[PDB]
């Protein structure tokens, strides 16, 4: 089977929790009984637009099946018992949410672009350093003044294990934008989608005027007979 | 356009504020605060007592 | 049913103590009794001073009795008897002045509109933070250049208790002005009336020029021969 | 039976749309056959932990149907089926998410405390100004450093009509903190839960230093040669 | 079979163009019938480092061959050319570096740890943001004061495709240090090794000092 449980990007981006019952390298023959069940044996909604009769002569069927959030969050192990003519034994899919994972909050720091790259006058890469999440499922989305940017503009690294913490992970998200936008100053917020967050979204923003500190310029006019009056 | 925010003539501090019409967009116009403080180098601590010691700390 | 008391808003703005109970049009009745009876028993006469004009509008009227003496300020068990033959249970309501409430002066803070809000260049919301008043009733009116602004321009909240304080209340007043008025530097004054104030009214004013400055330029002219200020 | 619908604040704190058919306007009687049925023609596991008998012209049996977010916003007209001695018919009230409400996102502005508040050195009130949102269902909670503060520390006003906008609402929520906590510099995030937000959560943040640099331009003029004239 | 290729991360760490063979997922008997060769058959060396049998019934005949860069960058085809007892027919690899790819220099930028992380005081992450390098090789190792940090401390992401440049890539490597270590002023120099660099090593230095701008701008005025 080519199927996957819903990772924490398509459940959150589409707001709806979708399974999969995709198969591969099977024979295009009779008895296409994919048999969407639950742990209780109840039938979930059937497949729509099955990807059968592939050009490489492989059987597949996209498991478009709408379910709730809570039953996938709970202990229900949704079995997809695929039975065919060549395989009368059911190709059961025990796809569910794994348990025992310690929920650790991301500690998202938004790193502004470096001074050398701003001095190159070409692009500004602003980093959403999402670190310390133990379930390695983050969906970072970049929003400009409340409007989410295109996914071609920002790319995110896959969740990689944290160096000095075993259970935690980390990820980045650069948003390569033009430097003439960064000199003007826009909010450039990065929302992160993780399960362990209390509201499931942390938004961090940085523009040009955050790390700029109180810049005193003192003028000790200790002797000036120029006739000026302050 | 220096509006007179205070004109305190007992501590000599004059504070004046203006909106510098710096750029075309109406937001980055800097609210400028002009504190002008005259420090009397030889006035005593109590001005009405001329035998008072010299005022050194000006808070 | 409702019997709205004269608050310090009705006491101070109108200088007229009007006992008012609203009889909604539950059922049409010819002789609607909105008789404002004292604990002594004499009734200061009111009848249909203004129609309620509810969405049903079936013989509904507002009776406002001008018991304007010191008997309300001292206190009495004033009762309007909403007794009706239709729905024969008398749906009366009793209101008295709250007795012995400790009086703390409001600390009135005028918050300028946010830098995030002026970037939209659409509207500016000025917040009058009347907080720290332990008698519940408060009157907040906005003025611009000494003229009372229209009550549709600003909206003030009901007083709710301050969280950390035991019984002291707080109130808001959000004045929604256009951004071109606030960025030109127009003084919006918050006039707030409370019993515990010494002069009974505090006026906070805010505008762009006072605000929070973004460039202090100080000149400590240390002159030997200052002497008198000039 | 007056069934209180699950508000967005109620389904956001619990992450479970628990709609309640609390038995209102029906006194304590026998023949309890309370069941929540979905509009398709079925019913689910319902009413965990109904309360005891309280014959104060009502009852205390509570609906606790744990239907989902994709169930409640699907528009399914859920009906409770309370029967009693006074009426031997299921009181099938129509409860669903109304589709007639416009969906405009909040413009959440987070005004810092006034400088007088820190000057008084006993309290600072950070006010979250949730304004410009069309459905009157906003849940505002505050986090200090990513974990929520207690609901006693902040107070959120009810959503009130924004007067200039036609049907948009506004709501302000203060959090009264100590002056010494704000002077250290903390994030003090205001999380606003609303349906019309793109990710259903926005978050704004004010530190001790949240504005511009406010660059100082001090000039110690330490001679009478450059001393001012009048 | 999987002919493991000499990558620049693998070459620069060992200073030898080392290529290994990976014939796994087979019957786990201990018989060695592999000689590493060239296409001409002249790269003949030892088939060492054969590890123990894997628990899932597979063998780990690996071997190790080392040659210089000149031949690897000359475009010569190399073949492991397995001839084993369980293979009914011999296989071929014809493995070489893909020539013709454009070479763009990495523009590495040392983003300092954010002020939100330094206020937490638990740790500080310094990211060497390697961008724009068109051959998808990088070797981001971190050294402070001339001595290389341990590979457990720093972790480098795989070179991902650049979002806006067509064929360029970016990499991202963080160094977890304690907050008290960053306040001392240690150098934390990020060293990148990529072939498109003119010198093949670039080192940038990130301190507490380089993040701080000119706070005071004192202007002494006389006469
Ligand atoms: C400043 O100096 C004046 C003049 O010496 C002081 O005023 C006198 O104070 C004494 C003692 O308090 C009184 O007996 C006099 O009646 C005051 N004379 C006048 C004209 O006011 C004044 O007290 C001094 N103030 C301070 C703070 O030292
Ligand atoms: C201080 O700074 C302002 C702007 O930052 C500049 O115009 C001014 O000339 C500076 N003072 C001196 C003495 O140069
Ligand atoms: C502040 O700057 C203005 C220039 O806009 C200058 O005229 C004024 O003298 C300065 N204030 C003081 C107190 O020197
Ligand atoms: C402050 O800066 C202004 C320009 O913004 C300049 O004209 C003025 O001289 C400065 N004040 C000093 C140096 O005291
Ligand atoms: C102080 O800084 C400003 C810009 O921040 C610059 O224009 C000015 O020349 C500086 N002062 C001196 C004395 O160079």
Swiss-Prot record, chain B:
<comment type="subunit">
    <text>Part of the secretory IgA (sIgA) complex that consists of two, four or five IgA monomers, and two additional non-Ig polypeptides, namely the JCHAIN and the secretory component (the proteolytic product of PIGR). Part of the secretory IgM (sIgM) complex that consists of five IgM monomers, and two additional non-Ig polypeptides, namely the JCHAIN and the secretory component (the proteolytic product of PIGR). JCHAIN-containing IgM interacts (via CH4 domain) with FCRM (via Ig-like domain).</text>
</comment>
<protein>
    <recommendedName>
        <fullName>Immunoglobulin J chain</fullName>
    </recommendedName>
</protein>
<feature type="glycosylation site" description="N-linked (GlcNAc...) (complex) asparagine">
    <location>
        <position position="46"/>
    </location>
</feature>
<comment type="function">
    <text>Serves to link two monomer units of either IgM or IgA. In the case of IgM, the J chain-joined dimer is a nucleating unit for the IgM pentamer, and in the case of IgA it induces dimers and/or larger polymers. It also helps to bind these immunoglobulins to secretory component.</text>
</comment>
From Swiss-Prot, chain E:
<feature type="disulfide bond">
    <location>
        <begin position="128"/>
        <end position="190"/>
    </location>
</feature>
<comment type="function">
    <text>Constant region of immunoglobulin heavy chains. Immunoglobulins, also known as antibodies, are membrane-bound or secreted glycoproteins produced by B lymphocytes. In the recognition phase of humoral immunity, the membrane-bound immunoglobulins serve as receptors which, upon binding of a specific antigen, trigger the clonal expansion and differentiation of B lymphocytes into immunoglobulins-secreting plasma cells. Secreted immunoglobulins mediate the effector phase of humoral immunity, which results in the elimination of bound antigens.</text>
</comment>
<protein>
    <recommendedName>
        <fullName>Immunoglobulin heavy constant mu</fullName>
    </recommendedName>
</protein>
<comment type="subunit">
    <text>The basic structural unit of both sIgM and mIgM molecules consists of two identical heavy chains and two identical light chains; disulfide-linked. N-terminal variable regions of the heavy and light chains form the antigen binding sites, whereas the C-terminal constant regions of the heavy chains interact with immune receptors to mediate effector functions.</text>
</comment>
<feature type="glycosylation site" description="N-linked (GlcNAc...) asparagine">
    <location>
        <position position="56"/>
    </location>
</feature>
<feature type="region of interest" description="CH3">
    <location>
        <begin position="1"/>
        <end position="100"/>
    </location>
</feature>
<feature type="disulfide bond">
    <location>
        <begin position="21"/>
        <end position="80"/>
    </location>
</feature>
<feature type="domain" description="Ig-like 3">
    <location>
        <begin position="6"/>
        <end position="96"/>
    </location>
</feature>
<feature type="glycosylation site" description="N-linked (GlcNAc...) asparagine">
    <location>
        <position position="49"/>
    </location>
</feature>
<feature type="region of interest" description="CH4">
    <location>
        <begin position="101"/>
        <end position="210"/>
    </location>
</feature>
<feature type="domain" description="Ig-like 4">
    <location>
        <begin position="106"/>
        <end position="207"/>
    </location>
</feature>
């Amino acid at each position: 089977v080519f199927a996957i449980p819903p990772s924490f990007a398509s459940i959150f981006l589409t707001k709806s929790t979708k399974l999969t019952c995709l198969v591969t390298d099977l024979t295009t023959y009779d008895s296409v009984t994919i048999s969407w069940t639950r742990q209780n044996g109840e039938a979930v909604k059937t497949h729509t637009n099955i990807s059968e009769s592939h050009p490489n002569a492989t059987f597949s069927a996209v498991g478009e099946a709408s379910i709730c959030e809570d039953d996938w969050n709970s202990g229900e192990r949704f079995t997809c018992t695929v039975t065919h003519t060549d395989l009368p034994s059911p190709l059961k899919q025990t796809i569910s949410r794994p348990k025992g994972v310690a929920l650790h909050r991301p500690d998202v720091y938004l790193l502004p672009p470096a001074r050398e790259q701003l001095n190159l006058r070409e692009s500004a890469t602003i980093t959403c350093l999402v670190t310390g999440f133990s379930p390695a499922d983050v969906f970072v989305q970049w929003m400009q003044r409340g409007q989410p940017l295109s996914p071609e503009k920002y790319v995110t690294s896959a969740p990689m294990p944290e160096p000095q913490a075993p259970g935690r992970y980390f990820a980045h998200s650069i948003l390569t934008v033009s430097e003439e936008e960064w000199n003007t100053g826009e909010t450039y917020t990065c929302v992160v989608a993780h399960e362990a967050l209390p509201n499931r979204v942390t938004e961090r923003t940085v523009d040009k005027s955050t790390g700029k500190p109180t810049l005193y310029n003192v003028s000790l006019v200790m002797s000036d007979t120029a006739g000026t009056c302050y | 356009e220096r509006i007179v925010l205070v004109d305190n003539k007992c501590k000599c501090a004059r504070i004046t504020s203006r909106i510098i019409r710096s750029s075309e967009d109406p937001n980055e116009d800097i609210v400028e605060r002009n504190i002008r403080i005259i420090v009397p180098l030889n006035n005593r601590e109590n001005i009405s007592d001329p035998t008072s010691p010299l005022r050194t700390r000006f808070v």
